[PDB]
């Protein structure tokens, strides 16, 4: 479940999965989002709406941010960033 989303500005649509890769709701679902800035541009993110009511804990459900390139190397965080 990997999609491209780059440019100068934009928004990652929440649970935007019934159009990209229509996954049935029953199974656990997870997806990653790839950002690319304008040449010579570090990026700042701001969350406009965040509510993971499925559980306070994340052994099932969570949202995280990765810096650098997309590896397990360095969790930026799992507030704005």
């Amino acid at each position: 479940c990997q999609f491209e989303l780059s440019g100068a500005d934009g928004i990652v649509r929440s649970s935007q999965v019934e159009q990209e890769e229509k996954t049935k709701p029953g199974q656990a679902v997870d997806c990653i989002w790839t950002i690319k800035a304008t040449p010579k541009a570090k990026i700042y993110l701001r969350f406009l709406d965040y509510q993971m009511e499925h559980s306070n804990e994340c052994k099932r459900n969570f949202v995280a941010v990765y810096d650098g390139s997309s590896a397990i190397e360095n969790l930026k965080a799992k507030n704005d960033v």
């Binding site: 993971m52 306070n56 804990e57 994340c58 969570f62 965080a77 799992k78």
Partner: protein
């Protein structure tokens, strides 16, 4: 014990078992609570608070 495996012992698996599990409320009460708003609350931040 042998060079190939150094982690073999009859009593390695069990350590100080004493009483099975724990007695009910031996060290911690069993307090119940309903989610009423200006009485109990989920903390503001979420992620470093599990």
């Amino acid at each position: 014990w042998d060079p190939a495996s150094g982690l073999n012992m009859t009593e390695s698996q069990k350590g100080k078992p004493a009483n099975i599990t724990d007695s009910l409320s031996n060290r911690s009460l069993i307090v119940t609570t309903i989610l009423e708003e200006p009485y109990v609350l989920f903390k503001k931040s979420d992620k470093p608070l599990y």
